[model samples]
Target: HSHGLFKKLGIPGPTPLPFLGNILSYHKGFCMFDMECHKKYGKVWGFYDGQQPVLAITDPDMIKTVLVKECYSVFTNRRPFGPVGFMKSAISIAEDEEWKRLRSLLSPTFTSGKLKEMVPIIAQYGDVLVRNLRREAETGKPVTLKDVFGAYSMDVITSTSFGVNIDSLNNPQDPFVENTKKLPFFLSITVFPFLIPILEVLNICVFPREVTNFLRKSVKRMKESRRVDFLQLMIDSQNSHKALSDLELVAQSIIFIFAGYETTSSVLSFIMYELATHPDVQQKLQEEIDAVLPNKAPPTYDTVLQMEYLDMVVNETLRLFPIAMRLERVCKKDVEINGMFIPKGVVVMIPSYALHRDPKYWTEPEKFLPERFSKKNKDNIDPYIYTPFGSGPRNCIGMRFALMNMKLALIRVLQNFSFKPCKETQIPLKLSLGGLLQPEKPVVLKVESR
Candidate 1:
């Protein structure tokens, strides 16, 4: 267990074995192991991911230093998931000059003005969600919220991103919907720590050819259709000056679907679960929904944007179940923090899921308290410790859009039906082993017509 990798500063962690160091420690899940590591080894420590040395960091101030522009150039590259087909050009996986170019080209597309224009499209999907829920409510069936919201969010993404409209909620077995349901099943992503280095070094294509073809064909239609949606925005950019090839177009389109789908739906499901279990919070949310749209008018961009309580609830949900449990980056330069030396080429992990629950930043951290992010108390909290959508220039580009979608859907659902915990609804969800941390099973709930 003795090694020079952890010998320099000797920041403590579980003793790593020769070839498979600390890999066995992640049996529970990455988030659980990370929290345990912080408990056993303080805030900053070194752990071996097979032979690779990764610094698992949970300190807010130190993390902020690495995230902001001061360390921008040195902390630019993200940990590679290997050359997984269209995944290579993904904004989540792309690095260096290409990342800058793609980020620059797409940044303006999510601005307030752009989202304002997309409001009607979001509202249309929101209405569809309600109508579908009404059908389930009549049967009084205990439906899995993940499946329910997954279809709802899928409809939003396809419509907003490609101008394609289909009732995924009603017709869940449709080809595109079926393909999306299979999207998160890439098991190679959760490969052993030892295999990660091998996968990246060999440029292994763990991404399935079937999924790749689905995305490629989707992009082909997007190019041929030429509707005034996200696809059109990209097309306009390509023609006007920012040129893009077929692969780049396909990569970005698939990335949007990946980025926008599971995370939003998972959060929506968790929010409903929490609200159902805690009827008091649900009532408060209903009051806010009523106040925001007094006459039961369709939620507009401005109206949804102005809901302070809605913002708090969503913020609280994100804190509890951050979609990206771990934020990772590769150090491009040698950086020293509080006498701890971090060399270039080492992977730095933010351990967001652990940080979100750290008692240092939250009071009664396990409880669902939306007031934690309220304006009166928010100023006292550090932004670095509360990031669910990430921070800095490289943070999630679709945050505003996602928030808008959540608000629109919640308002529409709450305005008409109430989410009630049934015999099947799982309280305090069990985390998934891979991909985003979602319920181990679909969180079932009873929908009652209001």
Candidate 2:
């Protein structure tokens, strides 16, 4: 908190509640709290999450202070202990020495060098995606693109993680896909301050046990078949002895694959939906994709990495409809913001959705304007103002891989077809209260092949 700012100006902070601090309003819209507060209080405000008085830093300067200028240790130390204890066996959730040991061992699997080799796998799914879209079009009906994208995610994750691409496209009702269930309530319960004790005991069973079984079996099968892919990477993991157990590996594998797919799928789904509504933007983006990837040969990894406009489209989509719309960090020690006091061992919720849409920072905050991300405009803008992936060292590890997958998928699909809003898409979009910000109704579009 800004101690100098606090003493000199006597600027008042946000109002806090008893148990749920900001939880009640936190999940409402995409970064709903940030949106409301930014609207009401302006850029920097103090709010409470549980007992902690978290300073909301939407200003790019302040955000950089939190994410970069401050000691590198600030980012890692702030993460929670509970989830780390339970799910640390997985890559992203682990901490400190454990994370060091694990991230180093698994780093080879997601490196740029390794991702280059994933093009065939990326192209394979992209082809299957085009085929599936054609089939959906054959029905002469609109498609719930989110559902199609979800299945597409499942297909790729299985291939990358298990070294096998299940036909989730053709067989949408595949059991492995079905077995993956959403636990929004489970997530909320984990966060609820009081239930932390009882919830911990029952949380083990709440997680998808069946999915674990299947994943463990698949890992064993990968060994038997001599399959050479991500699964092999996991098997040959130098820390395999201390890494994930087969069962834990299943949990971790599904988690990464599903995360990789779901976030990209949701982003693609929303961008297409948003594009359908905003025709001018859609045409402009379509023009960019068509110019770069117009060919019989599917988009390759190199093509994806090089296409600046393609990157812009994905970043634009993410800016508008980020899947992981918020970030949480706990204080290892006391910190100051806007001259206000922030206690140690407290949680900080940075409402990214709110920050992305803040009008003071973004011109026409709600509008669909992809070129706002062009090299010039981006150079003039604040880094913390538009981090669709996230900010800081702990930002999404799979960002490059996910970007390749989404850009290629969009390029292939848009080159063939176009998306526009229909009666089904909800106006004044209301993110479903349950899932990570997603459309409750299927977005329908008039499909026309170019």
Candidate 3:
């Protein structure tokens, strides 16, 4: 009965093994799996996460229809994966009216005004990042890109979100960094869909208990404290009529920490790797940085935005390595679009990594060409296919904050040092598919003073 759904609907897909479905095909990684499936099954195909039907959509118009046009009415919620404890209240997993409420309440915290105020906080950590990297560069040794960026991302998130300065770049062994590293376990839902309820019943959470507890306690303490940060902004909302409850406040804080920490760091690592391998692109970016912030002036929010090449470089890097490899939404009701029938509760999967690198959409899809995102050429690119931060209303709320943070750090670091490919550098980095896109091995690169 489980294997009959796709065939019954006349949808094309890889044949499923008994009980396990097509999960094993993803053993090579999600990107490769999607690429193979798209080649074999064309634009629309079905796969199973242990009998739970997932429709993989790579057609641009169909994706826009699902993510934008009918997002509110027919595909409002993400697939339910059974998050436990405070995670249940997080905006990412909250459904229907709860999702709307959380989205509205948290949206104001990420406004341009709020983020501009936190620029100094991010800049302080950016300084720490440069200092730490300079030390590594001085030793004439190769540095692991992810490790440094991971710690820097931790410092930025903790300082900006919670107003706590962990300085993880220097204190790499901080409990915050150590605990977060453990939270990247493979999602059991992909292989054993039946275990979601068991996980919920057992109170098992994706985040480590220690990390959640520390965040909960920290947020609780912050309610009594005040500063210009995410927690304080949300805490200030408590005076409003539509205020979030204390539990939701904690949940939002936890999601912010979890969401911002890993995603930003991973993207940073990939950006550095790309720069190291592509010297011409790196030189162009450095030239732009030099022209923009002549004499190494500290990057302010307004100044960072002025560097167009930096923006394009970040966009191009994201195109090659969209860390959140897939975007998913669940069908709310039976619907037919372009003669394709979508039954209620079926998950609609947008394999972003595959779509980003699709030859049909992007010219020279395998190459690193930031010029594709230049103001003159960007309009030619489809917004739906180039979604590094996703699209439509429910897109990443922290997009602006993330861009600003990344640009600032890149500017500060590039001003003092340049990335060079060392003997240990992977010529073609191998990627592993887990919760997010990650390099299969350490991305080691040499750092030289400019």
Candidate 4:
């Protein structure tokens, strides 16, 4: 139970197991946020890892170092998953020279200016989603809002990443959506630690190994095809296309869909659930939408960009229900954080969930207040304190695209209909610890025609 200087340096912690250390907690999945953690262990404590020493340090300053200097830390490499393994090269997971090469080569596509060109495509999916939801309301059939929103996010991601429009809005059960829903259940990514060892030792390929094969088919033809998708753009650049294997392209595409789809959908559901439960918020949101664009009037992509209040609402929802609630960084070399010894070969978790609720940094951390991120108020708060998209060298690469789609979603939904929480929306909404931490059921709401 030794971390060279985990405590000699004044870092509060429990103890670690011999050799195995804090790996068990990661194996336990997202349960790192279990009430037992805050109740029994306090905010900053040592976790029982299965292998390397892991520290669940939620102290904001310590967190800043881990995320910002991740590329050079023990977080230099992510612990591999699955039988054959994957994600070694994805931006969020990969580190070191490989991470350096990939991140440098890829950071351009997701910039603000680049994403502005893609806004219309996002708006397209949002429009379709709204129409379908209206149809569901008109027919009095229940709206599978999360499912539809997930599909909608998929369409935008696919269009951006692979230049393939899966038409997920019109066809919620499309192959992409079908595979997506099955993805976690297959790998049980939520239960990755237990399953990973089983797959590693037994050599069982739980997640679809078929993704590699699919990429081969998509890229078999010409290297210079006239496509504007992310893959195609990378392909068009000299030598950029050669660095990625067909298998990698396939795997990354899969990751992109999941990342771009599920996180945003969860955020959407959070927004809806929050707004539905708070009538004042709903009315205000609807009023903002109406004031910006009249009833049934189409919103130009540029116009949508101008709606600051809409952005605040989404940002507030994200603050309360950030889908990517935790981030892990392995130390690359020994470093000190908040004057505490953070040795090399250790993993660190920044509990975004815990941080969001930390009262020291936020005025009312638990309250659903959009004004916290209001332009004027936000400047007073430390930028590093609140990062649902994370921060530093490995911030989520598609953040611009994700926000564009999110903004479009708000425009359409808020403009045409008002949502009120219904029977299915659980009180203290059941956070799905078992899956990808989504609402256990549809955060259903009554949709009234505007």
Candidate 5:
């Protein structure tokens, strides 16, 4: 039953209870639950995050319709996480004029011309990763791939942002690295999610004060003595009149740090697991890497782009274990699409994991099939359905940066080591009850030097 909220709208979904609706259903785990719900119901269904009605969409056509510019005016704002200072200012969560301004300011930094400038920086960190992996391999012990990738990702983000290149892999006590690990704990959806409405009233921010303060100081120092790097790009933007105030600049930097590292590291970790488990897939990827990159030669920006098999492997890994569970948009005004009425205040949720794995869209959805994303097969996929970044105007701003970071890391790792399953490796991965599709247990892998 739609419970009058979605009854007349002709949607089917799980039943809801008072005060708590579908929150408990997700408490166990949202990805699997949402997948099951979508399987039971049809393409589009309704559920609740407390009393707030949510239209959960897996239909590609509906997804494309809601996310495009034509519908932006109505579905402009993302479902709020709360008015938590820095988070509110982030391009990911910002609305209306603020969003437009930030988007305009940051867009150029990711253009082909600007991103080409970042390639050398990416390769620099990739070298560090190779050194770290080689050091770990010498120890003859299984290392957690997630932790390894996290450190590499952190190095890339910190260096690009403030020109601060601290080796997180070697120095566990590094302040920047320490704070990043602590952030997900505070920002986890389980952190007072039930009381989201009152979190801002209670003056609680999603990120810990220490993390924000450290980032604030880092950005302040960079602003005071600006130099080359991505951080300077924003600082330059501020000088150009479409300015971000000091706090806003810090907010933007923090968002970039969080957006760039956290998800990219997770994806890299998952890719490692795939490589470790499927030796054939790993061999195919290795062959491509070997072909595109010569011995002892670092991959250039053009070479990375040209690696077709590497691209497919990354795409498949993203599809199988998506970082973002869903893409959210709240209706700013009453809107009707495809005979479905979406009243103002209703949240539309696009479950990417479910859509990517839907039998209708994918053959043998459970298997790890990189060929599904190969050049010949990729054109058959709809843009809306294969959204690891996301859909619409609010899609990840640092998409190119994230891809470059992941590819660089993968290139370096594959060049130096072969990831093999260890005794400690979790065969069938267990996911954490969190926002992203992260491994519950550490991703332990045997790092053999190639």
Candidate 6:
């Protein structure tokens, strides 16, 4: 009976089974699932995740209508995960006015002035990354990129966001690193969303209690600290007209760590893989970096911004492998835009992976050409179609911070080393099924000292 909903709406989609409703098809991962469904069912279609009906839109005009034009009136929230404790206060999970309040409160911390101040802090970790990887380069053995960048990402997020320093690259067994590794279980809701109520009643939590407890205690201690990091900024605002509750403060800090960690690391790993396989692009980017920061000078905020080719390479990597494979919004009220009827409470999904690779919008979509994002060509691109950080007001708030971290890391690494595909490197990489787009196997490459 659940499978009849899409047919009743006259929407075309792959046939789904009763109750289970397409859960089995996701074993290959959402990236593959998105591409396959888009190929077979066209831009607008239907699907199910455990009887939860979803309307996946890849059409650019429709995307604009939903995410930009009518976002406030029709799609103010995303589908909710029930009763997740403090996670309910997270900006990403909050709805309506709550989201607006949180966004407005935290938005000031990522401003250009504030991020510029953190460049030196992030660069210090970048120096550590170069020294650490230089040791691995000398080993003459293939280096696993995820392990290396994962640690580096952890180091950057912890120091920049919380003003806490953990030498993750130097010590693999650091509690922060070990705890983060266990947090991937939170995305299990994607498969069994129907069980959310039952799980909530049973007091089952997706996030591991120990890990959340660890992060909560750390954030609690920082509340009274006078440091100038993100946590301190939030604390300063605690006495403002509209202040975050103590629990909300802890929730935001936890969300920041989780949001910034795996996504940045995975993007860096993919960028290295692309650079390893494409020597010409890598050489051109290296040339740009050398020209910008001559004589091995450290990368400052302004200097990293000057390297145009580095920007393009990063943008290209994101286009091909957006860590947030899909952007979703739930319909707040029944509405129709661009001739498509969207019923109330139906989830509207924008399959970013499929949209980015769609042949209609991009020429030679599979190729690793960075010129598509060059200043001249980028203006011609529709924002809705190439949303690596998403589009409109609800887009990723940390876009600037994430880009700065990536640019600095790239600048520091290219100054001392070059990457090449090794025998152990997986060609045409296989991605694992998970919340983030992760490599199925370890991304092994040869890191040669330049």
Cα lDDT, all candidates: 0.80, 0.66, 0.85, 0.67, 0.81, 0.85
Root-mean-square deviation of every model: 2.6, 3.9, 1.9, 3.9, 2.5, 2.0
The model with the greater TM-score, 1 or 3, is 3
> Residue-wise lDDT of candidate 2 within 1-450, one digit each (tens)?
322332233434555456555555656643665677777776556655554455555666666666665534544544453422245466666665665566666667788887877778877887788778887776677788777887777777777767665777676465555555331654465346465555566665445555666555656776667733677777777342376455455546765866776687888888787778778877887776667667644677776776776667667778777777777666566677545445565455567878777777788978877788888777876778777767776677788888877777887888788775667667756677654777776666766666
RMSD of 1: 2.6
For model 6, state the Cα shift of residue 201 in Å: 3.9
TM-scores of the candidates are: 0.93, 0.86, 0.95, 0.85, 0.94, 0.95
Clashes of 2: 10
Query: Model 5's lDDT to the true fold?
Result: 0.81
lDDT of 1 by residue, 1-450 (tens): 334566676778778887667777777878888888878888788887766688888777778767775345777877765547456777667788878778887887788888989989989988888888888999968877777788889998878888878788667677777776667323333334445566656755666668778878877865776554788888877771357767887788877888678778889998998888888889998998898788688999888978888898999999999988888888888878655688877888898898899988899888999898788988888888878988887888999999998889999999999888877666667888765688887888889998
Superposed by TM-score, candidate 5 places the C-alpha of residue 81 at a distance from the truth, in angstroms, of 1.6
lDDT of 4: 0.67
Q: How would you encode candidate 4's per-residue C-alpha lDDT over 124-215 as one tens digit per residue?
A: 77777777788877876556668767767777776777666676656656654455555544334333456667665674554565654444
Better of 2 and 5 by lDDT: 5
> Residue 427 in candidate 1 has what lDDT?
62
| Highest TM-score against the true fold, candidate | 3
Q: Write the per-residue lDDT of candidate 6 for residues 382-449, one digit (tens) a residue.
A: 88999999887789999999999988988899899999998778998887787668888979999999
Residue pairs clashing in model 6 are none
Clashes of 6: 0
Worst ten-residue run, lDDT, model 3? Answer: 179-188
How badly does each model clash, as a count of residue pairs? 0, 10, 0, 15, 0, 0
Q: Write the per-residue lDDT of candidate 5 for residues 259-281, one digit (tens) a residue.
A: 77778888888999988899999
